[PDB]
Amino acid sequence: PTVIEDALDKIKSNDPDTTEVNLNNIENITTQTLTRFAEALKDNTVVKTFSLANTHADDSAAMAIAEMLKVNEHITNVNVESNFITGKGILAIMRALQHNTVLTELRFHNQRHIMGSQVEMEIVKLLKENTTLLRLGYHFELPGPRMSMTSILTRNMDKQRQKRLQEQKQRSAHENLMEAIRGSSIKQLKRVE
Amino acid sequence: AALVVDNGSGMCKAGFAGDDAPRAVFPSIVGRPRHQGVMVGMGQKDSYVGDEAQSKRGILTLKYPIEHGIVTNWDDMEKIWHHTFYNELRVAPEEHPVLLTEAPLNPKANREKMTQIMFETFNTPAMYVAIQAVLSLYASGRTTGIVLDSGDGVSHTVPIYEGYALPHAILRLDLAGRDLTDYLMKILTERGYSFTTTAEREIVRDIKEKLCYVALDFEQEMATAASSSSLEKSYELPDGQVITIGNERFRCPEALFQPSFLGMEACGIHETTYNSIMKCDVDIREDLYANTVLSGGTTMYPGIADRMQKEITALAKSTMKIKIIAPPERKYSVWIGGSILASLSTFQQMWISKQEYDESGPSIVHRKCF
Ligand SMILES: Nc1ncnc2c1ncn2[C@@H]1O[C@H](COP(=O)(O)OP(=O)(O)NP(=O)(O)O)[C@@H](O)[C@H]1O
Ligand SMILES: [Mg+2]
Description:
The structure holds 2 protein chains of 2 kinds.
Chain A: H1 4-13, E1 20-22, H2 31-42, E2 49-51, H3 59-71, E3 77-79, H4 87-97, E4 105-107, H5 117-127, E5 135-137, H6 143-168, H7 172-182
Parallel strand pairs in A: 1-2, 2-3, 3-4, 4-5
Chain B: E1 3-7, E2 12-16, E3 24-26, E4 30-33, E5 48-49, H1 51-54, E6 60-63, E7 66-67, E8 70-71, H2 74-89, E9 98-102, H3 108-121, E10 126-131, H4 132-139, E11 145-150, E12 155-161, E13 164-165, E14 171-173, H5 177-191, H6 198-211, H7 218-227, E15 233-236, E16 242-245, H8 248-257, H9 269-278, H10 285-289, E17 292-295, H11 304-315, E18 324-325, H12 333-343, E19 352-353, H13 354-360
Parallel strand pairs in B: 1-9, 9-10, 11-17, 17-18
Antiparallel strand pairs in B: 1-2, 2-3, 4-5, 4-6, 7-8, 10-19, 11-12, 12-13, 12-14, 15-16
Helix pairs in contact in B: 4-12, 5-6, 5-8, 9-11
Magnesium ion (MG) binds next to loops of chain B.
PDB class: motor protein
Keywords: actin regulation, leiomodin, filament nucleation, motor protein
Assembly: dimeric
């Protein structure tokens, strides 16, 4: 429910009033069209969210996006869900994020096929060196990579907690609680369906 | 004005503290385009959540953020939580403290991330984290006992002493309601009608919940079944056809007591409970025996508590009294216990405040909670 031609025209025009780029559920299925969307956004600075969900996008598009994420320094969120990307395109993007300070959310759910154990542990390896990414939209099948990842994203957000900390700056109770929990019952609660 | 949120492995119940029941109950589930690229009924969306996900399933692949009570996808977990606050509950997380629940033996990393999401993303004034089993004990008006929490994915035995679960004596059994729908599926398929379509597996789960029960004496109810038709019951599928099961009714949940029926070398829930009690201090065992609380949807079978009393009475010492408590509202006992707790004025001192987190970070959850 969005026209590709004129919107793209606004990207390369760097229209001040285009902070969202939403290509979700579009039949275009043109690898070239999406790859020139990447080049279009490459020098853009207004866009903060570039999404293409379920567009039959392939690995090349993931490559264009991958290299580009280092040029573009204003997109905070990228979405490539429900497309057909392999560990190649995804790992390319991750290697891009090896040095990319802006991007903070990246989602690739419901892909064509499983990434693979080695691909997942690779993801966690690369992103170990990233500090700005806060949300990763993927379900790791292996517990190791998954726990490593949640630890990473926790410390990246913690950096926000710390920087905000310095910026903004410059038992009887339990026993009585239990005594209270024993004296309770459902008859004290607001009846509602 | 506290909020309570019980995140089940497959069902999410969220509401306000001090309420009799949760105001919101929807499937903890996030669905996305099935596949074959752009075969879309959705206009401009990348995914659906909650009720909209259960419907529209025709072209959706439905994925749960919580597996076996442990968060395995934190992005879809944050989605479910946003959907909870803003779409189903209609509240600002910034103006309410939040009580969240976790499963027994939850990793510390997931506890920290839970807290970090609550304080950073949703910017809640305060928040707290409690074990579901413990909130079921509190809901039964008890502070000491042992809880058998069997839900969708996994089953846990949790000894509790004066408000603190005992991690050394917690026991885990990887057998729950879904294993019993699967079992019932197989025994029904084998003998005549094929239950393959998931839409029909929902019919199998409905048979389970409507007609299955737990036999006190299995080999007697088998012999009764073979001698007479006294135990037969029929069920009306959607196409008007009817099926008659009798012997499957109690064989399905028998797996809870004999996991071997599912090719499992583990021991049933009765042994798992007793064994947990034996790992506890010999002083409190007698109050564990007398206070064995049931929670979770899989504990709703008729006669489940009767056979608990029998089998555990056979394991324990002739001296002890074995009382098995099977509350009503056992499907929502976790939430209701949370509603009580969050309502108690004696609990307001226990919340974690956002300033404490801003100082110490999410690690503060390991103490000040457990
Ligand atoms: N009357 C019933 N008889 C038997 N099983 C039932 C009944 N009602 C519900 N169930 C089952 O109970 C389960 C629901 O348990 P539930 O209380 O939702 O746990 P959960 O929180 O969603 N998952 P978990 O986090 O693993 O405890 C499902 O497998 C249902 O099929
Ligand atoms: Mg539960």
